[model samples]
Target: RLTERGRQRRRAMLDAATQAFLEHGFEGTTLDMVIERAGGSRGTLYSSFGGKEGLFAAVIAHMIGEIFDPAATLSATLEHFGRRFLTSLLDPRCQSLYRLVVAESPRFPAIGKSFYEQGPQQSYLLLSERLAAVAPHMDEETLYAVACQFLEMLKADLFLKALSVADFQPTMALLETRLKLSVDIIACYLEHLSQ
Candidate 1:
């Protein structure tokens, strides 16, 4: 585990590298420039994060968290997570990053898996933790399973629509409507079994 300073340094480096990656992409980017742009050198990059390949892995995880990590705390109820989940997905950064992963990950499989592992899996764990807190009657394993199902249900075919739409904007009313429908549907199956 990294100390606080170590984590902060890594975050700073990731922010600096993000623009360069956006501009030049993984293939087009020059590692020397990336190293310099991160305000470091080969020695620093290697010592702090292995090397270029390792740095790219770190960056992938960083970007995924940036785009997909839920902002709600664990104490927030499932209702809060439901809203936050939709809001996070609707973020322009999330949309762009999803598009980018779909486009580039076919050629570079590591990027795809890393994004998945960092984004969806992390979100699932976070949701499971919150759900376990809120629905303590449910066993840990069951909460984790429900967490996965809830997330999948939350996604619920909206991702495809989000992808191809151009210059499109969805109203909060639309999001809220879908969320209501989602809650009713999920609750039909997720109701208290042991209450």
Candidate 2:
């Protein structure tokens, strides 16, 4: 177990690493830069995180936590989760991070995998949990699969369009449509299960 100071140092390192990854990106960042920015030595960085990749993984995890931690509250309804998920995607900082991850993913497959696992997979799992609460008759695995599809529908071509030269503006109506579609897709799966 880590002492309070150790945990604080780890949090500081993670914050620094997240800022560096967002600003310089994964490929552009180096251990020396992270250590300098994080106010730690190479040894401290390595001890806390195995390497640059490990640090990047922690950065991704931190971002995921910021976005999804509140959404995990039991009092949060499915609609609330949908809103938070979409809002996170549309947030300028998160959008920039997504671009950064995509740009550096080819060079760092592990970073990409960690991002996907920590972000999408975890979000889907939470969505599945909420679905199970509402529709107790639905199987967990099927709920997860359908939740995956629901997310795909929510994301749609928005990421690609955002990356491209398109001047697409996401409005409240657009978010509402995405949320409705996601809820409907999950509802459809539950409907079939009820038949």
Candidate 3:
């Protein structure tokens, strides 16, 4: 376990690294800049993070953990998960990170993989767990498929607009409309299963 001082320094480094990455695309950011911004020495930064790529990976990991971890405990009801999941996506920082990932992905494919693995893949697994809790009669693979379909419905257009295409600010009304539609679709599918 890290001492209080160590933990403080680590937190500072992470905050600085995240800011550096956002301000300067991945390729442009350097360890020196991170250390200087973080108010730590080069030795401390390297010892704490290993190196620039490692630190970048940590940043991505931390962001994913913040957004997706809470989602794991969502009620067994798919509709509850659907609403929370939509709100998670529409979160301002989360949306900005999606944009940043797209902008830097071509230059750093590993970052893209790390983000996907820690974020969506983990979220799908969480959804599968909730599905099994709610619909115990369904096999695991079938439940996973249902969860994937539900997530796709929630993510489809908003993800595209946030990532690949330029768009106007997505208002709460737009997000609410999509959230309702996604929940409705998932509820209908589950109702079919009960019949």
Candidate 4:
């Protein structure tokens, strides 16, 4: 266990790394740079986190949690859940981070995987869990399929537009339309398939 001071030091390094990742992107930022910024030694960094990629993995997990908890439990209707999920999932900061992932992934695939598994992949699992709870009548595989479809469809045009264009603001009316189309279509499909 980390002593209180040790924990403090770890937190400090994490903060410094977050700032570095923000300013430099994953590829541009280096473990040496973070250690210098955080006033730590290379030994401390390797021991505290397995290596540079491990620190970055921790960074990815930290960022996702800071933004929103993908694995949060929600005791709401499906419609309410989608609204909350989409609201956070499509957040501008999250979109920008996603853009960073896309730009950096080709060169630093491990970091990209860390971000994906912690962020979007976990969201997929949470949504699947909720779908299973709500539609127990449906087979597990079917509900799982529905959940994936729901999230993929959810991210389709609006998410693409948000990430692709500069300063592209999604209008409230636009998102409402997206929400309605994805939710209604998925609901209808589930209802039809289950019966």
Candidate 5:
């Protein structure tokens, strides 16, 4: 097993590699650049990540896994989850990754597939489970639908807009307003459904 320090070092390497991927895309990023940035050993990188493809895969998984967090009343739970979801979606690196996937997926379809499986699909399932917990009376289909809608609402046009426009950063005030409205909207719908 990797010791505590070893685990920390691995994370640094992954972070360095993730940045390189974002800056250079898959083909442009090199394993040597990763090692140089992380100040890590080539042997360790190879042993830990296998190679550049493996490291890229690990980075994709690592980036999305960063956003996973959760709890509380229905409104509280919706607010909590929506905040996390919106923040992650708006993250600069994650946005760049979306653009990279769009540009490269035709040649590297596996990258697109892996990204969807690890990112959106996982978020969808987790949000569905959280919605089910907070709104237990809601049927499975309705809860899942609400979860999907809430997530979509949380991102809204920000994701697409940011992807289209370079260096587009949404104001925190806007995100806060959106988050509150999304939770309020979903809660309102659920409340009406129950009545």
Candidate 6:
């Protein structure tokens, strides 16, 4: 129902809301905060967006598209995502943070939930979108499961070993090997499914 001008305004609001949400999170951010950044009326937001929660959902959808990158091929796209995923997981700081979370999550569940939501959940959703685009014939549940499987395959037990093993460092060679194998396995499966 929105015109082109209204669409631009909505976009600006979405962008501003994204910045606020990313910085302060959902509970920490407010509609007034977004309005202050976006320069729109509260009534417009209420009527157009259905309220703050609706706006938050829009921001999440927007972010997923914002983070997703389409490459020349499925393999290339998977490889790019895999490299980044592994590199971050294997970083020393992240390793330490994981260990700390494991040790402390029992006492404080929120940190664990936060990490899972922000990290692997986001990755799986992004990969699911990629898979859906590349292999539209695949069903949603299966596609998401495959996304999770591929990401875990890319881990290749290095993450698990890093948690309990002292001084165990994952090398680029190992990462590439794992990523390649995972990509190959998934690519072949998808190809077979398409046949």
Best prediction by lDDT: 5
1-195, model 6: which lDDT tens digit per residue?
Answer: 679988988899998987886666566789999899999788777766888767766765565444432877888878887888788778765655455445545655765665568666988998899878877788999999988999988776799988778788788888988999999998888778756
lDDT of 4: 0.75
Indicate the worst ten consecutive residues by lDDT in candidate 4: 70-79
Q: How many Å off is the CA of 70 in candidate 1?
A: 14
**Every candidate's CA RMSD:** 5.3, 4.4, 3.7, 4.0, 3.4, 9.2
lDDT of each residue in 1-195, candidate 1, tens digit only: 468976776766777666666666667666677767767556655766776666666766777767775323332356577888888887766766676667778876898888888787888888888776656677888778877877677665565577687755767877777777776665556564555
- Alpha-carbon TM-score of each model against the true structure: 0.67, 0.72, 0.80, 0.78, 0.78, 0.62
lDDT of each: 0.70, 0.75, 0.77, 0.75, 0.82, 0.77
Q: How far off is residue 39 in model 5, in Å?
A: 4.8
Lowest summed lDDT across 10 adjacent residues in model 1 is found at 69-78
For residues 76-120, could you state the per-residue lDDT of candidate 3 as single tens digits? Answer: 366677777878887766876776677777777998988888787
Candidate 5 residue lDDT tens string, 59-134: 8768766644337788988898888888888888778777777777687678779778777877888888988887
Q: Which candidate wins on TM-score? A: 3
Q: Model 4 off-target regions past 4 Å?
A: 30-47, 50-52, 68-76, 106-109
TM-score of candidate 2 on Cα atoms, chains taken together: 0.72
Counted clashes in each candidate structure: 0, 0, 0, 0, 0, 0
- Taking all chains together, the TM-score of candidate 6 against the true structure is 0.62
Question: What's the best-to-worst order under lDDT?
Answer: 5, 3, 6, 4, 2, 1
